[PDB]
Every structure is written in C-alpha cells, then in structure tokens.
C-alpha cells in the first residue's frame, strides 16, 4: 500500500533524493549564491551615495578574460587553471550623476567566482559539455 510505513531500507531512497538535489558541497554553493544574489546588492546600497553620486543595480557577468592586446572573451576554469588566471566575473553598477538643482554601466572590478555556482559556466553544463570543456563530471 501507498500509506504503509517505511522500513529501514527505505532511508537510502531519501538519502539519494538529498544529494541528487544538493550534492556534497551545498554549503559552499549556497553561501556564495546568497552572497551574489542578495548580499552583493545590499553592500552596494549601504553608505553608497555621495555629495550627488548614487549607486543603483549591480550586475555580475559570466567569467571573462581581458586579454593584453586582445578582446575580452569567455574564460572557462580549465583555461584559468592552465594559464594561471583568476576565474572571475566583472562587476558593473548603475551610477546616476544627479546634480543638486534647487534644494533650497560602470565597471567596479572583478569578483572571483566559485566553481559550479549560478554565475559559473559549469552549473548548467551537461556531461558531454564537461568533457568538451576538459572538466571532470
């Protein structure tokens, strides 16, 4: 029956559900994904505004490389690991140049990306894509 109590063997089905969903490093990923998705915007909106330069929405690009005498392109971890590069994404914010009048977009820098997080290429990569990217599934 579908309403019958579960036995001790049944616990592994649950254990497989967990892990199939979380994997083994969820704490790492969950923390970073929270930092990128929420914390990052919150830091930008704290003391921010000046005397008037305001800071709006923050954007996190997918990881790229600024090539010396070259163009900017997608940086994958295997190329980062081999060429001694930092697997990082660019931080871009909306800056308003509000000028007093009666009283009385912009690149911030590069954020290192955690591998297999939302902003990382590998997060949505299939098994065939991983081998193609010289990354172990």
């Amino acid at each position: 029956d579908e309403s019958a109590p579960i036995t001790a063997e049944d616990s592994w089905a649950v254990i497989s559900a967990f892990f199939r969903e979380k994997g083994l490093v969820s704490q790492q990923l969950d923390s970073f994904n929270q930092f990128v998705d929420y914390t990052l915007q919150d830091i930008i909106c704290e003391d921010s505004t000046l005397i008037e330069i305001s800071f709006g929405k923050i954007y996190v690009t997918k990881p790229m490389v600024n090539e010396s005498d070259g163009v900017t392109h997608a940086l994958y971890p295997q190329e980062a690991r081999l060429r001694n590069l930092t697997y990082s994404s660019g931080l871009f914010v909306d800056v308003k140049k509000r000028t007093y009048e009666a009283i009385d977009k912009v690149f911030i820098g590069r954020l290192p990306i955690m591998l297999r997080s939302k902003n990382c290429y590998l997060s949505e990569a299939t098994e065939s894509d991983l081998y193609k990217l010289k990354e172990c599934p």
Partner: protein
C-alpha cells in the same frame, strides 16, 4: 557530517510582522503582574513581545515552515518550562534533515509522515536517470533541525526498530535497548549520516576502537587513487 547544511540567512522582518498579527503583545505594552503566564518571544536574540497561547502560535509557525511559507532553514524553539519562544533566521547555523513523526488515526500513536507511496515516487524519479527532496520538504515529510531546536525534540533512531508495537532473539546480533520513550516528534534518516566523508569509507567502524577510526580518517587523504578523470 554527510547530511548537515549551514543556514544561509533570511530577513526576519516578515516573521516579526506575522507575530504581531497572530497574537503577541508588544514589549512597550507588557505588564508582568497582569500577564503572568506569558511566553517571551525572541527573534534573533531580540525580545519582541509576549504571547498567551504559545501552543497555537507554535502550531501555526511549524505548519507554515512545513508548507514552505516560512523558509525551511529558519529555526523555531519553544521552551515550555521556561515560557520562551526563540526564533533564528540568521546565517551560520549548522542544521540537518530529519523525518517528521506525527499522530495517525489515534492520538497516541505516532507514525513517520513518509509512507511507502512517497518512497515509490522518489525511486520513480531515480529510475528516469518529478519527485525530489524538495517534494518531501514542501509536503512536510522531512524537516531541517539545528542544535538549538534539537533541544526541544524527541528523535527515534530507526523507523521500525523504534516504533511498531510490543507483544527468540539472535545471539549474534548486537544488543539494542528499546522504545522506553514513545513521544517522538522526529526520526533519524539513517544513523550512519552522523559521519563525514572520510569516516564514511571505513567498513564496520562500529566494530573498531574509536581512535582507529580517527586514524583511518587521516590516512584515507594520503591514499592515491584517481583524484579526477581529467
């Protein structure tokens, strides 16, 4: 340990609003001699107010977290004897999942919420590699617990071997005590989950002098294999 997670952090503000909306006298308006049997309500170490019928409030708070209306990582601890309700939404709290145990048919007489039907759906999804971990969580069959909440609960170690009924033995088998407590709220998914990555490799660590398991844990990291396919 294998199944433990860490709280990410949730804004406490909607909980505070809900508490003031679902009872809760504000602290400014508290007069102890005229509210003697009132539960003190704390949200992230801040005492917000008091409540008369914390039993109903606590039932409401748990139902919502089990639906997903309150984030599953939020911990709500009721200390009946101390007249305190403590809620934590903050990051850093190490928690672990547990099966929920509840009364079924007769007020007594607990049963795990997960039934064979749920397991079948779990395994259906396994064979097509639909019903995931989030399904168990959102349907409130399983639930996250941190050490603070662990204090208010009674956990059975096995589903069967901890709650069927009483009315020969294998001499070879190890000695197990009994029910001796039958007021369970939860049950362990599987005791081997108390172990982390390294110790999970040891065969029968329950048959070894403890420091040997600590020693193996160290050496397993010094054993060469195939670290990565690439």
């Amino acid at each position: 340990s294998l199944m433990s997670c860490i709280s990410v952090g949730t804004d406490p503000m909607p909980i505070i609003t809900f508490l003031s909306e679902w009872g809760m006298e504000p602290l400014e308006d508290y007069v102890p001699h005229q509210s003697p049997d009132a539960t003190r309500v704390f949200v992230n170490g801040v005492w917000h107010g008091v409540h008369r019928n914390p039993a109903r409030l606590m039932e409401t708070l748990r139902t919502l977290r089990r639906k997903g209306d309150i984030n599953p990582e939020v911990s709500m601890i009721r200390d009946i004897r101390e007249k305190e309700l403590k809620i934590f939404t903050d990051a850093g709290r190490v928690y672990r999942p547990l099966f929920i145990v509840e009364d079924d048919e007769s007020l007594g007489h607990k049963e795990l919420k997960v039934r064979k039907g749920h397991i079948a759906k779990l395994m259906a999804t396994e064979y097509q590699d639909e019903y995931t971990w989030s399904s168990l969580l959102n349907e409130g069959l399983v639930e996250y617990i941190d050490a603070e909440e662990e204090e208010s609960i009674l956990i059975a170690m096995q589903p069967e071997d901890l709650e069927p009924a009483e009315a020969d033995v294998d001499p070879a088998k190890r000695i197990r005590v009994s029910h001796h407590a039958t007021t369970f709220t939860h049950c362990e998914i599987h005791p081997s989950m108390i172990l982390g990555v390294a110790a999970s490799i040891i065969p029968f660590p329950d048959h070894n002098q403890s420091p040997r398991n600590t020693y193996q844990s160290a050496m397993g990291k010094q054993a060469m294999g195939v670290f990565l396919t690439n």
